[PDB]
Write an enzyme that holds these catalytic residues in place. Structure first.
Site, PDB file in Angstrom:
ATOM      1  N   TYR A 160      -9.139 -18.682  85.174  1.00 16.71           N
ATOM      2  CA  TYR A 160      -8.905 -18.809  83.737  1.00 16.71           C
ATOM      3  C   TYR A 160      -8.980 -20.283  83.361  1.00 16.71           C
ATOM      4  CZ  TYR A 160      -8.070 -14.752  80.857  1.00 16.71           C
ATOM      5  OH  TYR A 160      -8.279 -13.631  80.127  1.00 16.71           O
ATOM      6  N   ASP A 172     -33.755 -18.731  67.014  1.00  8.76           N
ATOM      7  CA  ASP A 172     -33.310 -17.968  68.201  1.00  8.76           C
ATOM      8  C   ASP A 172     -34.521 -17.789  69.058  1.00  8.76           C
ATOM      9  OD1 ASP A 172     -32.777 -15.955  70.124  1.00  8.76           O
ATOM     10  OD2 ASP A 172     -31.710 -14.699  68.668  1.00  8.76           O
ATOM     11  N   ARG A 221     -27.176 -13.311  83.064  1.00 11.33           N
ATOM     12  CA  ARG A 221     -26.957 -12.828  81.704  1.00 11.33           C
ATOM     13  C   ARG A 221     -25.922 -13.718  81.048  1.00 11.33           C
ATOM     14  NH1 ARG A 221     -29.934  -8.227  81.664  1.00 11.33           N
ATOM     15  NH2 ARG A 221     -29.387  -7.654  79.498  1.00 11.33           N
ATOM     16  N   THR A 233     -30.657 -16.820  75.102  1.00  9.27           N
ATOM     17  CA  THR A 233     -30.164 -16.126  76.254  1.00  9.27           C
ATOM     18  C   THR A 233     -30.779 -16.784  77.447  1.00  9.27           C
ATOM     19  OG1 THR A 233     -32.044 -14.600  76.147  1.00  9.27           O
ATOM     20  CG2 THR A 233     -30.026 -13.934  75.043  1.00  9.27           C
ATOM     21  N   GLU A 253      -9.664 -21.381  79.830  1.00  6.90           N
ATOM     22  CA  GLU A 253      -9.744 -21.337  78.371  1.00  6.90           C
ATOM     23  C   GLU A 253      -9.692 -22.695  77.684  1.00  6.90           C
ATOM     24  OE1 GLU A 253      -7.844 -17.744  77.540  1.00  6.90           O
ATOM     25  OE2 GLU A 253      -7.534 -18.084  75.413  1.00  6.90           O
ATOM     26  N   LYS A 286     -33.839 -13.763  80.372  1.00  6.72           N
ATOM     27  CA  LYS A 286     -35.210 -13.297  80.181  1.00  6.72           C
ATOM     28  C   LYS A 286     -36.195 -14.238  80.884  1.00  6.72           C
ATOM     29  CE  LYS A 286     -33.973 -11.372  75.746  1.00  6.72           C
ATOM     30  NZ  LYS A 286     -32.581 -11.846  75.793  1.00  6.72           N
TER      31      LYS A 286
HETATM   32  C1  8UR Z   1      -4.801 -19.940  75.225  1.00  8.45           C
HETATM   33  C2  8UR Z   1      -4.183 -18.619  74.807  1.00  8.45           C
HETATM   34  N1  8UR Z   1      -4.865 -17.507  74.439  1.00  8.45           N
HETATM   35  N2  8UR Z   1      -4.065 -16.417  74.059  1.00  8.45           N
HETATM   36  C3  8UR Z   1      -2.836 -16.887  74.233  1.00  8.45           C
HETATM   37  C4  8UR Z   1      -2.745 -18.265  74.694  1.00  8.45           C
HETATM   38  C5  8UR Z   1      -1.456 -18.991  74.922  1.00  8.45           C
HETATM   39  C6  8UR Z   1      -1.423 -20.305  74.153  1.00  8.45           C
HETATM   40  C7  8UR Z   1      -2.280 -20.552  73.072  1.00  8.45           C
HETATM   41  C8  8UR Z   1      -2.230 -21.755  72.363  1.00  8.45           C
HETATM   42  N3  8UR Z   1      -3.129 -22.033  71.321  1.00  8.45           N
HETATM   43  C9  8UR Z   1      -4.550 -21.807  71.675  1.00  8.45           C
HETATM   44  C10 8UR Z   1      -5.427 -21.957  70.439  1.00  8.45           C
HETATM   45  C11 8UR Z   1      -4.904 -23.074  69.580  1.00  8.45           C
HETATM   46  C12 8UR Z   1      -5.875 -23.327  68.427  1.00  8.45           C
HETATM   47  C13 8UR Z   1      -6.751 -24.541  68.666  1.00  8.45           C
HETATM   48  O1  8UR Z   1      -7.050 -24.899  69.840  1.00  8.45           O
HETATM   49  O2  8UR Z   1      -7.139 -25.134  67.636  1.00  8.45           O
HETATM   50  C14 8UR Z   1      -3.571 -22.680  69.012  1.00  8.45           C
HETATM   51  C15 8UR Z   1      -2.544 -22.642  70.117  1.00  8.45           C
HETATM   52  C16 8UR Z   1      -1.280 -22.713  72.720  1.00  8.45           C
HETATM   53  C17 8UR Z   1      -0.399 -22.490  73.772  1.00  8.45           C
HETATM   54  C18 8UR Z   1       0.610 -23.562  74.112  1.00  8.45           C
HETATM   55  F1  8UR Z   1      -0.013 -24.720  74.172  1.00  8.45           F
HETATM   56  F2  8UR Z   1       1.349 -23.283  75.178  1.00  8.45           F
HETATM   57  F3  8UR Z   1       1.453 -23.683  73.137  1.00  8.45           F
HETATM   58  C19 8UR Z   1      -0.477 -21.298  74.484  1.00  8.45           C
HETATM   59  C20 8UR Z   1      -1.238 -19.098  76.454  1.00  8.45           C
HETATM   60  C21 8UR Z   1      -1.254 -17.753  77.202  1.00  8.45           C
HETATM   61  C22 8UR Z   1      -2.166 -20.102  77.174  1.00  8.45           C
HETATM   62  C23 8UR Z   1      -0.287 -18.199  74.337  1.00  8.45           C
HETATM   63  C24 8UR Z   1       0.854 -18.777  74.265  1.00  8.45           C
HETATM   64  N4  8UR Z   1       1.892 -19.298  74.189  1.00  8.45           N
HETATM   65  C25 8UR Z   1      -0.428 -16.920  73.925  1.00  8.45           C
HETATM   66  N5  8UR Z   1       0.570 -16.207  73.428  1.00  8.45           N
HETATM   67  O3  8UR Z   1      -1.689 -16.211  74.005  1.00  8.45           O
HETATM   68  C1  PLG Z   2      -3.059  -9.237  75.781  1.00 10.89           C
HETATM   69  C2  PLG Z   2      -4.397  -9.925  75.941  1.00 10.89           C
HETATM   70  N1  PLG Z   2      -5.494  -9.425  75.360  1.00 10.89           N
HETATM   71  C3  PLG Z   2      -6.724  -9.972  75.439  1.00 10.89           C
HETATM   72  C4  PLG Z   2      -7.015 -11.127  76.166  1.00 10.89           C
HETATM   73  C5  PLG Z   2      -8.429 -11.694  76.180  1.00 10.89           C
HETATM   74  O1  PLG Z   2      -9.054 -11.655  77.449  1.00 10.89           O
HETATM   75  P1  PLG Z   2     -10.411 -12.459  77.747  1.00 10.89           P
HETATM   76  O2  PLG Z   2      -9.781 -13.729  78.307  1.00 10.89           O
HETATM   77  O3  PLG Z   2     -11.077 -11.699  78.851  1.00 10.89           O
HETATM   78  O4  PLG Z   2     -11.101 -12.616  76.405  1.00 10.89           O
HETATM   79  C6  PLG Z   2      -5.890 -11.804  76.863  1.00 10.89           C
HETATM   80  C7  PLG Z   2      -6.183 -13.071  77.644  1.00 10.89           C
HETATM   81  N2  PLG Z   2      -5.036 -13.634  78.307  1.00 10.89           N
HETATM   82  C8  PLG Z   2      -4.815 -15.076  78.364  1.00 10.89           C
HETATM   83  C9  PLG Z   2      -3.742 -15.242  79.416  1.00 10.89           C
HETATM   84  O5  PLG Z   2      -2.787 -14.435  79.349  1.00 10.89           O
HETATM   85  O6  PLG Z   2      -3.827 -16.092  80.317  1.00 10.89           O
HETATM   86  C10 PLG Z   2      -4.540 -11.177  76.733  1.00 10.89           C
HETATM   87  O7  PLG Z   2      -3.459 -11.692  77.334  1.00 10.89           O
HETATM   88  C1  PLG Z   3     -34.236 -12.785  69.947  1.00  5.75           C
HETATM   89  C2  PLG Z   3     -33.059 -12.148  70.651  1.00  5.75           C
HETATM   90  N1  PLG Z   3     -31.825 -12.621  70.462  1.00  5.75           N
HETATM   91  C3  PLG Z   3     -30.719 -12.121  71.044  1.00  5.75           C
HETATM   92  C4  PLG Z   3     -30.728 -11.037  71.931  1.00  5.75           C
HETATM   93  C5  PLG Z   3     -29.396 -10.551  72.479  1.00  5.75           C
HETATM   94  O1  PLG Z   3     -29.256 -10.618  73.880  1.00  5.75           O
HETATM   95  P1  PLG Z   3     -28.046  -9.886  74.615  1.00  5.75           P
HETATM   96  O2  PLG Z   3     -28.833  -8.676  75.067  1.00  5.75           O
HETATM   97  O3  PLG Z   3     -27.751 -10.795  75.755  1.00  5.75           O
HETATM   98  O4  PLG Z   3     -26.960  -9.630  73.608  1.00  5.75           O
HETATM   99  C6  PLG Z   3     -32.038 -10.379  72.231  1.00  5.75           C
HETATM  100  C7  PLG Z   3     -32.186  -9.201  73.192  1.00  5.75           C
HETATM  101  N2  PLG Z   3     -33.120  -8.172  72.772  1.00  5.75           N
HETATM  102  C8  PLG Z   3     -33.426  -7.018  73.592  1.00  5.75           C
HETATM  103  C9  PLG Z   3     -34.852  -7.092  74.099  1.00  5.75           C
HETATM  104  O5  PLG Z   3     -35.663  -7.871  73.545  1.00  5.75           O
HETATM  105  O6  PLG Z   3     -35.201  -6.390  75.053  1.00  5.75           O
HETATM  106  C10 PLG Z   3     -33.226 -10.981  71.559  1.00  5.75           C
HETATM  107  O7  PLG Z   3     -34.444 -10.481  71.767  1.00  5.75           O
END
Ligand code: 8UR
Ligand code: PLG
Ligand code: PLG
Ligand code: 8UR
Ligand code: CL
Lengths: 442, 442
Positions: free
Chosen positions: B54, B208, B243, B234, B56, B237
């Site tokens: 992770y 694009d 991907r 992308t 982020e 291709k």
């Molecule tokens: C990075 C992220 N994604 N989703 C989250 C977080 C968390 C988080 C998010 C933020 N954000 C991430 C986006 C930011 C907006 C920007 O960048 O302009 C606003 C605050 C800040 C914190 C922390 F620093 F600890 F306070 C934690 C944690 C899991 C890292 C979080 C908390 N606390 C919660 N609840 O959920």
């Molecule tokens: C409840 C929940 N839902 C959705 C996501 C999004 O997942 P992707 O990172 O795959 O977009 C998170 C990410 N969790 C951040 C953390 O807890 O460290 C989450 O905690």
């Molecule tokens: C111009 C263009 N832009 C964006 C995408 C989106 O790609 P993802 O599949 O990774 O979302 C495609 C894929 N087009 C399907 C094809 O031409 O076979 C594309 O042709």
């Protein structure tokens, strides 16, 4: 007309950074609550030539030819997902194409409410995710607060979800969806009560169980499948799969949701599925159903209970004074340090954790805590007896952090100057490495 | 506390489907314009433990600890991307975190115009993508037509982009973005002329180049980087990477676009980056810069020309009667068969292609053509002299399809009964396998 020289020869520069990353993972106490380590079978899938295939659409309805074996992999993943979460293919459906957690949640919300639709989620500062409608007074931080109309429910000052407030908000605001299941919330969720509030106002019940998924699948914690219309989950955290997501939908409660969710994923938001992910998810979902994985998941909560208990025995405050799941939030106000500072201190000793808000904090800049969790270390073989050592290491890091603040001051730029060379950190790192580097590494 | 048994032992069911996919890919003439085959080095990255992390946020500004080597991989990929497309790190920036093409285009459009914003793009039926604002009278098919306000410019009856119509549309509609670069358009783009229209109504120029990226990089076709504000692409291709996707933004022409695009990707839409992707993209971007990849790319257009030429010499009609890039659209009206039928026929003989619309069609059900392209076969070592054979196989497929239509009728369900066991299809498949199974397979 290609180069098939191995990675080492073709790109020695990149290969060295990855050999390094590998060593760092091996020699680290990983307490990131959202992280795990995948087995070699899941990494063989992610490496597999199936990612060559464009297979836009759904199985049997593909806009490309040559998708015979892809449709089987996609169908085998869906079956195993519905089997892992103990739901019937008669009343529950699953889309397995969302590329990750945030994509899945925006897609599922869109399906339900559409652009400018009304939604409710828990505040970021209180434990909710960005994709649960998070914004600031200054900006719409998540797309889920801009493409939708969102309202956010704070927890009480003790750190618990305030259902009295949820209901006050739902009656006035009148949203089409209510989100529960959270990012850094250390307790269980009463979904039943969420269902009764959703039913009062004819809103959908959305449960995002990414952090707690394994517990749900193994019936260790509450089951939101009894009450929720939609359940979202990432596959890369406690579930220990690849980076992917799953949207579950309740067909019985909402017929024609299947088409709405499936159309939201494609062609509303995504194009071609990432088939190596789908293959990888399938491989981990067979593991999820075994009794061996239940044992692992049980160990996560065993380790988490023990870890919280050992931190309290060293006078460290926890949000809600404990945990029902895999994760703990340490409140660092009594020590007058920040989580940004403790995260760097812990980064210098090979302890991976993250900064985290608490209830008293008014800003996400200067968060007053850190979050830790046990899935990763439980995967590495760590038991209840090992938690005292991790608690010992976190306690020394906090103490060292107090000292480095004392010496160099509260400014973070000044604080980092303190880190390199510090004898205690070097002795501590050494301790972390010697123990971490010994554990089983998948 | 894990299972480190290999994939074959842990999951024999899945392992057999993937061995089958592997064999199908090896024994297929792959003409899907959007597909290629990744080398073993790109596949090692996708299987790498870096996907455990992770990370982020952006390099140096991570919400998690232990991101030192991940930050080197992400900065190394950005370097190699700006290097590969011959742009200066002073003038251009790149986000390397988008998970795929459609995610990249939605994010970048958001950055530029926001919810309710106005955009223009080429109609699907004329060669444009879903993410270029595609909708139908019935429904908003793409989110890009719903979260944004879109209008769509068609090509003329000749199959060519009509700039007169674009300008006319831009003056009346007054969008903030104009999208060019396409999915199944067989000719080069006058970006310069698009720039002149964007400036007239103060709109951004969105290029694009996903389908034609390698040509742009190696300077065989026009360079949109001379005029465009944003370039999306992308990497899976013609570029022959994993991907993933890339958003390029012009800093010099638009101060402050960097933050705006970087914030659209995260935290607006995505969460944690997929690091194995980024590793993989970095690996292929080094290959893109060599003179050997330019050679491959040149061979792509050599094969495409030859293939168009050999199909015309067997009296098969092409849209725009030819091509300047890697792809051809066959117009099948004169044969009174649909693309759906020829796609099914071609799948029975191990020839991968896709159905495709043409200018005369009013519907996307019953598309009047198919699209083909040479990137994949050029990767497998096929040269100009090999194209006559591919053209001959496709001619024989068309012929067989007319016969099967004659015998079983126009209905697609009726038509497929004709496919199994057909002597000449078995004969052709046999011929396809024998030649395809012999070619170099990365
Ligand atoms: C990075 C992220 N994604 N989703 C989250 C977080 C968390 C988080 C998010 C933020 N954000 C991430 C986006 C930011 C907006 C920007 O960048 O302009 C606003 C605050 C800040 C914190 C922390 F620093 F600890 F306070 C934690 C944690 C899991 C890292 C979080 C908390 N606390 C919660 N609840 O959920
Ligand atoms: C409840 C929940 N839902 C959705 C996501 C999004 O997942 P992707 O990172 O795959 O977009 C998170 C990410 N969790 C951040 C953390 O807890 O460290 C989450 O905690
Ligand atoms: C111009 C263009 N832009 C964006 C995408 C989106 O790609 P993802 O599949 O990774 O979302 C495609 C894929 N087009 C399907 C094809 O031409 O076979 C594309 O042709
Ligand atoms: C699947 C897809 N994605 N992006 C595309 C396509 C293409 C395509 C899309 C569609 N769609 C896909 C979305 C669909 C919307 C819905 O279900 O409500 C509307 C028709 C249909 C066709 C064809 F069948 F050939 F006509 C081709 C091709 C490349 C597969 C296409 C064309 N033609 C173009 N231009 O771009
Ligand atoms: Cl991947």
């Amino acid at each position: 007309m290609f180069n098939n020289e191995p990675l080492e020869q073709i790109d020695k520069e990149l290969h060295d950074i990855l050999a390094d990353e590998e060593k760092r993972q091996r020699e680290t106490i990983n307490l990131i609550a959202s992280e795990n380590l995948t087995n070699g079978a899941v990494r063989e899938c992610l490496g597999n030539r199936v990612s060559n295939k464009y297979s836009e659409g759904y199985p049997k309805k593909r806009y490309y030819g040559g998708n015979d074996f892809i449709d089987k992999i996609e169908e085998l993943c869906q079956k195993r997902a519905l089997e892992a979460f103990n739901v019937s293919d008669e009343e529950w459906g699953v889309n397995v194409q969302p590329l990750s957690g945030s994509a899945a949640n925006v897609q599922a919300l869109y399906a339900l409410v559409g652009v400018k639709g009304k939604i409710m989620g828990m505040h970021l500062c209180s434990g909710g995710h960005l994709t649960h409608g998070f914004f600031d007074e200054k900006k719409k931080v998540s797309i889920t607060s801009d493409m939708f109309e969102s309202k956010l429910y704070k927890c009480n000052s003790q750190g618990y979800v305030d259902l009295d407030a949820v209901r006050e908000m739902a009656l006035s605001f009148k949203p089409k969806v209510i989100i529960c299941g959270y990012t850094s919330y250390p307790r269980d969720i009463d979904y039943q009560q969420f269902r009764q509030i959703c039913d009062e106002v004819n809103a959908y019940l959305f449960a995002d169980i990414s952090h707690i998924s394994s517990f749900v699948a193994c019936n260790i914690l509450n089951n939101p499948f009894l009450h929720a219309d939609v359940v979202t989950t990432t596959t890369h955290k406690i579930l220990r799969g690849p980076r992917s997501a799953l949207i579950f939908f309740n067909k019985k409660r909402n017929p024609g949701i299947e088409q709405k969710i499936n159309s939201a994923v494609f062609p509303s938001f995504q194009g071609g599925p990432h088939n190596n992910k789908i293959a990888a998810v399938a491989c981990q979902l067979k593991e999820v159903h075994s009794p061996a994985f239940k044992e692992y998941t049980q160990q996560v909560l065993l380790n988490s209970k023990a870890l919280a208990k050992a931190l309290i025995s060293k006078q460290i405050d926890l949000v809600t004074n404990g945990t029902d799941n895999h994760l703990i939030v340490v409140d660092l106000r009594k020590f007058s340090i920040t989580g940004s500072k403790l995260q760097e201190t812990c980064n210098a000793i090979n302890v991976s954790l993250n900064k985290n808000t608490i209830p008293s904090d008014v800003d996400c800049v200067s968060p007053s805590g850190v979050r830790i969790g046990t899935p990763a270390m439980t995967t590495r073989g760590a038991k209840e007896k090992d938690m005292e050592f991790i608690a010992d290491v976190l306690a020394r890091a906090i103490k060292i952090t107090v000292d480095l603040q004392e010496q160099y001051g509260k400014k973070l730029v000044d604080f980092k100057k303190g880190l390199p060379g510090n004898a205690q950190l070097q002795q501590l790192k050494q301790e972390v490495v010697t123990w971490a580097g010994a554990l089983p590494f998948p």
